[PDB]
Nucleic acid binder design. Structure first.
Ligand SMILES: C[S@@+](CC[C@H](N)C(=O)[O-])C[C@H]1O[C@@H](n2cnc3c(N)ncnc32)[C@H](O)[C@@H]1O
Ligand SMILES: [Zn+2]
Ligand SMILES: [Zn+2]
Ligand SMILES: [Zn+2]
Lengths: 109, 95, 98, 222, 86, 103, 82, 110, 97
DNA sequence: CCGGCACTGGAACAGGATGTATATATCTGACACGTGCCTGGAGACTAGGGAGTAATCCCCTTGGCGGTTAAAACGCGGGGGACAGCGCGTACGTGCGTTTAAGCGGTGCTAGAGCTGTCTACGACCAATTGAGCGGCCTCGGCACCGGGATTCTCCAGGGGATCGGGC
DNA sequence: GCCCGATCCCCTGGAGAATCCCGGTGCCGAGGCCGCTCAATTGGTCGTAGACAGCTCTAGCACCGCTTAAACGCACGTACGCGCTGTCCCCCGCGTTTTAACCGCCAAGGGGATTACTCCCTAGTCTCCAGGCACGTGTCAGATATATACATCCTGTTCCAGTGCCGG
């Protein structure tokens, strides 16, 4: 341990822990051996998928003139995009509600 | 007593401050993003496992991880994520 | 003559009041007394965490609210505007439960 | 006119002559019903019989109703009654002796099996000597029933625009056969007659000398 | 043994409670035979989940039902739920 | 001169109830093999060019396509009867698929 | 050598047979062009996954196990082919 | 080795291989260790479920004056049993067909 | 000839259990594949559920007590009541004799 | 027989009461920072086997040809079913007044979940040795078709007979 | 008045039929029989995972009292199911003629599938040390509570089109 310790997730330019994803892959009964560019690939996808469900909820909050995010903005952000609605199609979100929607035959003529 | 509970809160909070500098988040929502990340990790791992078993191999590699993403993610997500990963892996080696 | 709104107005204006809130729409004590009574058949003298009963109410309400949305399309198919006990059975049968 | 028309060789079934065979199938391509030992009449006349509704004859070895099932009427042959009475100018006709109900099995139509080319050369031969043939009936493709040389009493019928029976097609033991059924019940003493849609290759040379309101028509119009 | 049996607790889901659940689903007019059928539909859904929760609880040799038993019992049927741990 | 007689034809709905009984008892496949096999080879030419197939891999897609269609035509019928009809129209397939989940 | 016109090799009688095995008695006249659009979005979902499984293994032939895996992945298990 | 060999199916009283279930459990990535009465319990459960289906399939093949099971009798056996039909609900059996059933509003009426 | 390699199946145990129930019938070459798939498909559910039961509880061993819970979660009502008896008797007959 | 002092539904249109959106004030409880410390990640070697790469063998996917017959395409007709217009009467919605439990403060008691510490029985690892199970090769042998003698039943037949109109 | 040579309801020498029955030929699939090899049983040694026995101390169950928001009846009138009748046009059952799926061949070559040899990449041990977790604390965002100000739904009160049926 002569040189100064340089973290593995700074060599790649990421924010998620490449050193802990590896320990979880190894103790999880997935295979006998685990390569070296597997965690550097999985962290870079877990980080991209979460930086786009938040960029929509931050936009949805600005329409109520609010500063924080609550479980309702995540629902309004997920059920209004037809890709996240196809990925999260059988998931329930606590304290989320429904979308405003009413058929036309019921409206007064 | 009070041994430790690990989570992803401090990385979700670092990702938020790059897309929205003047914004916060509450506890009921941190506890939903946590379940989200834990749920997707385990759909992508348990399919690379099966691929390696079908092909009679003993090692999980980035070539299995890349293919387990095209079978799970729909449409344009599967085209942006595949380009995200192959830049981190290209930068990591040349160092 | 106390001004007597017409039939179908007060209903249409709470359809869109209950689609902006996110609260829970059943009483907590009546719902908690039924959970402890269903589960006397499988094992006696149980105890429940305080937040294990709050997790069941949410699943239940999310199940019913989405069964009613399937029931409401069969009625419009048959050219009605009311829902009857024969429109629930078609939804459940086509879904694949009964 | 006390004489008797040219005799016919009496017969009970159809005898093949032409170039087509019969289609008696094995007892694994025969349909099965849904009844069972039950109230009075199994496979009756007023019942929900899946073999009866679709114009099938049921077999006594395959029917679950057993052997007292009433869907066997092409073998028992409980035919109609009193024979030719004299008409006025129509040929011979017939008449009924016993009262008959509504929708009951009147006698079959039976003859010999001839195909298209043999039939047409037969008529082209019998035309040059002016026999005025009066006995032909097609059933399906490449098959014809004929009752000229031989047959039974159902060869003595007529045409009327107010008839009492029609010619249906039932499938008996893998083969298709013809049988005349009564539209509505009638007390005994009337001349049996049925409509037939002719398809003359030449032209219509006969008026309907029967007598009714709409019956004027022709022998080939409606 | 303060375990006086409970009885006739399904009639605690009153008809206003059901009219509100139907308003949130977008319904304008309601019949009068729906209230005795919604209860039979709910009492069949709750049993399939309480059975598996008690089965998960006995394997660990416990006496208290927790909030992870319910989440596992629900996920086992294709009804994942975010918000209560995991 | 000499005419031919013709027995009465069937009332509509009988030759269609004999086939419901004939086809619900066989087991064979109800589509033609070369027509079905050219469609599979033109669909796959948009994902990867110049590839081959196995005779028992083309025969496995045809067993699942028919099992999908025969089971969708059974949900269409119940909607048609709900609406008090006998005929199936193109707006019953859509209701079946929407309640089922696929659209 | 590209192809086309091949969706109309699923004729009208072949659809009436599949309707009779399902149990229907009358059929409208617009069902025939409505069914050829449903059958063509089910086949793509399966052939895409089969070709992905094939390309992972460095082959050029589509075997009969690729199809079984691509079908099981969608909850449509099939018995009798391996 | 010094004494004569006995299998492990013979000790338990089974017809299925208790020695071949064990290495499939050990080489399948299910855990780090495996007990000794896990394969002996998992074979006696795979034998019961096989007998349960073959009995009904034979009873259903008998009713055609046939002496041989084909894939149609396996379908007829399971689509009639209200529990094997719940265990095998999302499964296709090749060359099976369907069950005969006509609706009551389509049958001809006078 | 290159003496192709071997490949295992349950097609001699499936044909031993049939001679107990129906001592005179036979089975077809295409009806044998379906029973192969059946057994290989029911093995994996019961193994994969116990694999997770053991991980929820922080253990590293699969015993005859996780297989008795996987069965009670996977099988229906009256089916999951004779399988438990079968499996419980075939271990008592083995651990003593 | 269309025009006529006075006649009848139809059409519009503000104008109330009620419900929905504002602009300040106050104010509590949870979010966003700091500090100390323990455990989990990174740096440096070392020894063995899993996978990349080249080469040979033969199976099976593709391509063209002729020919026989069953299925698909096209055009007539006629009766049955889908869709629209009316009318009657039963049940669900809107509002008002009276009764019954859900909810919010506490308080006290104890059951049971979580942590710590020894200590023995159970599963992994390795070596020598024999039989259970898979691949290839013969037999028998229960069914589908073809003769065949051919047995109950049918039936064509010119004849055996009781009758007759005159014959005698 | 007796009787003669024809003269019509039975009648059986063949003959013939159909097909109950008993038995020759010829088969695609399944059932048994020896060589052979590699995977399961026997026998020991050992060290970590799990089973009991305390011991602290959080949280789930039980009771009491009060204030008010929600559930429960009860009546009226109005819109909406549900049955009936008439009409017309589209989907079903027929014949003809045209097209291409199926089946049996024969030929050439891509690529799937074993087998051998040699690096190089992942596991496994020691060290060292810094990033992430629990604990403690302050201040500010969002949740009510008033007061006023409009939008929104329903109807009374006017007002054109056409004129009720009288009538010369
Ligand atoms: C059907 S053949 C039967 C042979 C014989 N004439 C008979 O009646 O038994 C009767 C012939 O008489 C004619 N015919 C029968 N009934 C008729 C009728 N009602 N009107 C006109 N012609 C009729 C037909 O043209 C036919 O050619
Ligand atoms: Zn019957
Ligand atoms: Zn019968
Ligand atoms: Zn006439």
């Amino acid at each position: 341990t002569r040189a100064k310790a340089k973290t593995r997730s700074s060599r790649a330019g990421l924010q998620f822990p490449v050193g802990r994803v590896h320990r979880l892959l190894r103790k999880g009964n997935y295979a006998e051996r685990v390569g070296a560019g597997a965690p550097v690939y999985l962290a870079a996808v877990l980080e991209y998928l979460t930086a786009e469900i938040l960029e929509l909820a931050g936009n949805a909050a600005r329409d109520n003139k609010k500063t924080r995010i609550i479980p309702r903005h995540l629902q309004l952000a997920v059920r209004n995009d037809e890709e996240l609605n196809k990925l999260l199609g059988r998931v329930t979100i606590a304290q989320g509600g429904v979308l405003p929607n009413i058929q036309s035959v019921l409206l007064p003529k | 007593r009070k041994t430790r509970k690990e989570s992803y809160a401090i990385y979700v909070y670092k990702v938020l401050k790059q897309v929205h500098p003047d914004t916060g988040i509450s506890s009921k929502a941190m506890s939903i993003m946590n379940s989200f990340v834990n749920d997707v990790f385990e759909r992508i791992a348990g399919e690379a496992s099966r691929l390696a078993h079908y092909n009679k191999r003993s090692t999980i590699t980035s070539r299995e991880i890349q293919t387990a993403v095209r079978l799970l993610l729909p449409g344009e997500l599967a085209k942006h994520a595949v380009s995200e990963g192959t830049k981190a892996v290209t930068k990591y080696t040349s160092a | 003559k106390p001004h007597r709104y017409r039939p179908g107005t007060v209903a249409l204006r709470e359809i869109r009041r209950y689609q902006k809130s996110t609260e829970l729409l059943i009483r907590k004590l009546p719902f908690q007394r039924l959970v402890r009574e269903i589960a006397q058949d499988f094992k006696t003298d149980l105890r429940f965490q305080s937040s294990a009963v709050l997790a069941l109410q949410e699943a239940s309400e999310a199940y019913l609210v989405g069964l009613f949305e399937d029931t409401n399309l069969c009625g419009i198919h048959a050219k009605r505007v009311t829902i009857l006990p024969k429109d629930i059975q078609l939804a459940r049968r086509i879904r694949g439960e009964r | 006119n006390s004489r008797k028309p040219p005799p016919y060789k009496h017969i009970k079934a159809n005898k093949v002559i032409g170039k087509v065979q019969i289609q008696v199938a094995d007892l694994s391509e025969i349909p099965r019903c849904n009844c069972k030992p039950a109230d009075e009449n199994p496979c009756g006349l007023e019942s929900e019989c899946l073999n009866r509704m679709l114009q099938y004859e049921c077999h006594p070895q395959v029917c679950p109703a057993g052997d007292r099932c009433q869907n066997q009427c092409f073998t028992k042959r409980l035919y109609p009654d009193a024979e030719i009475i004299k008409t006025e100018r129509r040929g011979w006709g017939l008449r009924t002796k016993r009262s008959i109900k509504k929708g009951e099995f009147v006698n079959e139509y039976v003859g010999e099996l001839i195909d298209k080319e043999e039939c047409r050369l037969r008529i082209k031969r019998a035309h040059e000597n002016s026999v005025t043939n009066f006995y032909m009936l097609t059933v399906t493709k490449d098959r014809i029933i004929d009752a000229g040389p031989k047959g039974n009493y159902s060869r003595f019928m007529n045409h009327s625009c107010n008839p009492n029976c029609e010619a249906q097609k039932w499938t008996v033991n893998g083969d298709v056969r013809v049988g005349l059924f009564a539209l509505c019940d009638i007390p005994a003493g009337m001349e049996l007659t049925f409509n037939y849609n002719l398809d003359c290759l030449g032209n219509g040379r006969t008026e309907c000398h029967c007598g009714a309101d709409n019956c004027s028509g022709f022998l080939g119009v409606r | 043994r303060h375990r006086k049996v409970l009885r006739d607790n399904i009639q605690g889901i009153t008809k206003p409670a059901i009219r509100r659940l139907a308003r949130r689903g977008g319904v304008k007019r309601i019949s009068g035979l729906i209230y005795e059928e919604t209860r039979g539909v709910l009492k069949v859904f709750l049993e399939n989940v309480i059975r598996d929760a008690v089965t998960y609880t006995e394997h660990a040799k416990r006496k208290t039902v927790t909030a992870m038993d319910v989440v596992y019992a629900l996920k086992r049927q294709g009804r994942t739920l975010y918000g209560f741990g995991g």
